[PDB]
Symmetry: C6
Subunit: 173 residues, 6 copies
Amino acid sequence: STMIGRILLTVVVIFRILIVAIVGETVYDDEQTMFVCNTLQPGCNQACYDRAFPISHIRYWVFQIIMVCTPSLCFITYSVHQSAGISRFYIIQVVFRNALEIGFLVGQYFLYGFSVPGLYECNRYPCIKEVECYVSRPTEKTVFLVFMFAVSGICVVLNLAELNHLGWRKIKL
Amino acid sequence: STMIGRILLTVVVIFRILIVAIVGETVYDDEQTMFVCNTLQPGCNQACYDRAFPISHIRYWVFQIIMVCTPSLCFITYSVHQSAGISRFYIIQVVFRNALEIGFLVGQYFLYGFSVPGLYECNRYPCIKEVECYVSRPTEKTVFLVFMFAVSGICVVLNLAELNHLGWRKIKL
Amino acid sequence: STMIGRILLTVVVIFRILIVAIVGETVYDDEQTMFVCNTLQPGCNQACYDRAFPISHIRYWVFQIIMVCTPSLCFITYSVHQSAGISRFYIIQVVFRNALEIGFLVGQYFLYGFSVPGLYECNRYPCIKEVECYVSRPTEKTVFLVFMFAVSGICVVLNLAELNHLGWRKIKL
Amino acid sequence: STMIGRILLTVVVIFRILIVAIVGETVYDDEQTMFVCNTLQPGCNQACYDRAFPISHIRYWVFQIIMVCTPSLCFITYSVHQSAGISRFYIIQVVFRNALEIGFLVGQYFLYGFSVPGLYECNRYPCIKEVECYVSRPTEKTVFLVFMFAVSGICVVLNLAELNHLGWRKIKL
Amino acid sequence: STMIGRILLTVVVIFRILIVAIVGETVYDDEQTMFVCNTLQPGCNQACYDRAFPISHIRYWVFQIIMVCTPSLCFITYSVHQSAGISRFYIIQVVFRNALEIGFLVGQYFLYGFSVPGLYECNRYPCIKEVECYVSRPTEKTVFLVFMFAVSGICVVLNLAELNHLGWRKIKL
Amino acid sequence: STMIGRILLTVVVIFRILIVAIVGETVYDDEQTMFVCNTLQPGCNQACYDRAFPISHIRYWVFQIIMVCTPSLCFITYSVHQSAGISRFYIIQVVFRNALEIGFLVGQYFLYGFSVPGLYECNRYPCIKEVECYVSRPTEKTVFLVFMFAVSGICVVLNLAELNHLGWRKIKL
């Protein structure tokens, strides 16, 4: 069942890349232009949006995708250069991909949670005391967040299955 | 008629992909900017738009297209990996494509219906009690929705015809 | 004269595709942003624009182009599948392309006419009784409409010439 | 000197295509948004802009470029179809290119003149009597218009030289 | 040092093309939208911007790049036509490239100077007498202008070195 | 360990290029539109933004990437020209790339520091005395700046390792 595992992993990676590159940019285009705070203080919108969304979801997902693909690029470069042994490099890159995927999943959970609330309570300068701000299309962003989390979890499960197939004794050496 | 069925299925899939990728993004570009609610409450436009359109039609159709194409990608990857038995994989991927197409059709019907009304009655916080909001180019979006439903139905019919051609006794094994 | 007819048909199809894909999107970009109605009623602009232009000319032309190209795609896919009788398929696709072109020409005439008036009289809710709206760059859109109609007419004439060359006794059989 | 003439003609055609496709779209992007009329009448801006610029320069130049390239496409398609006499087709396409280029140059002169005035005097409904409107970046558009006229004139001269090289008694037959 | 000279010239040309195509468009995107004049007179912003920046730097640089590359295109086309003596054409195109680069450098100096002031004093109709206008991101544009001047100067020096290597007694013949 | 060093250097360079080209443009899109100063003075926003961000981070990073890749382009062009000794050119380009990377890292540190403050105190004409301005999404820009600094540091370390592998006595000769 290793071959089906590799096929599924490749398919899921391509699926995630396509979904991000196609829709993520459009979904988060007006994230700040349509972010409005109930206030008259100049600069409160900027500060409140920055506090609410320190890093946009799309940027985080793009960075995650590139980082997770990086070990594959390392392996491909090594293979290309070798021609004008590789099993150890393959095992190492599998381990690194596992670690990177797990770390990115955990970071996404700890940074964004599982939903984007429609209201934000912002109490940052220059806003006077505490103000209420309203997010743009929170439901679509929540769906995107949950779907990306599910896809990353599937990738993590497939990578863990591949690692188990490789076996502990074989990564120890 | 299996060959003409496959030809028609491929043609319809390419047609749907082209139509989406070419016009869908432009049609739904100003969905939120031109969405206006008869109110003075800050943040009511965002909440009302989010309630009216939890997921944009274009995003749902893009996701549907990628998901429906996924089994073909799995089959192609399996074929590539095999070279440096496949009939069972072909039957399985045909079944999965049929199921995915039917599911996406049903989901589209249950999520969007058959028309996009020009008026929306929004009663979500912070809007005071009940307010009236006005949708951008509802007729074009209704035409797009109906056309996509028809194309998906044609795809479902072709997939069912292919499944019937394969026969129950072959998919059972 | 069949060969020159085919060459002219191909050239005209390519020319129409190029013109649309290059200038239509830019011409019809600010169709709604620059559409203004003389009124204070919120949501009257959206309703009046939707009534005036149920389907943008550019979307209709893109759909027409893809649909009229569809029979050629069907023929190409059939030819590819055959290699690892075709005259009948060629005749059938010629007939279908002729019918599609004629239908799209008639639909364009019945749906848009021959000009885009600079003034529109809109009496749709929520607009109070009757209001006057002003279209964006009506002259350029009128020129585009007339030019597209002329190109479609040339395509129809070429298709009819090809059909006449083929002969009724051969389409019947 | 026919070889150098053909080389110069090809280079000039490519140069014009590159210049248009690279800068023309950006130069005319804000043609309507930055067009302002000294009035309070709703819809007067749209009418005055439409009267001042019935067809954008960029659209006209794109149409001209495609049309002048069309005879070359016809020749290439004829050559492709011939393989699985051509001198007459070459002469005919050269004559047609000459006629098209001359006609487009004359049309540009009669439609746009040689400069884009910074002020426009607009007396079209709904504008109250006569109003003054101000064009966006008129100097850049004037420079672009003059440069395009010069390039088209160079193309016309080269095509006329090629025709003279071919000779009257040879086009006649 | 003719080989290293040619390599450096090619690298510098590619570098300039890349820098322009990548950043120049973005740098000058909001040149007019962010250009503001201290006045209430309608149309004063357009007139003052047109006077301050008759031709955008990016358009001038694009035109310069294409024109400077034109002799190379002529040489390549001549070489292609020759196959189904060239030293003279090479010398001629070297001379023409040198002349074009020098002319464009001189024109840039005489047209834009070496800096973009943050304030512009505009006294063109309809502005009343004399008004003050404020330029968008003048420092970035000044840096871009100086950098482009330096790159063009390097290109001019390399071309002059190549010409000196060729020798006057060889260009004369 | 030279081999893993080269592979890592190539992978990191590709990673930086991808990250910039994919997200940097979008992160810094509304840098000036969302820049707001607490004042009524016309033209104060432009001056304050220009003072706060003389050169956008994205432009600096693009310039750095192209300049750092330039030595590789020189080496490739030299290799191509030689075919229809190279070790010295390889060593020279390695030294130049190391120097360029170090210089760009130092320049980035001196020009931008390590964070983008959310508040800016601007006292440039025409702003009256001293005004407060609010930056757009400062946290995301700070994260991007720190990440780019880390990547550049990794590149510098790898280049220094390669230089040490080559040794002093080889670069000296």
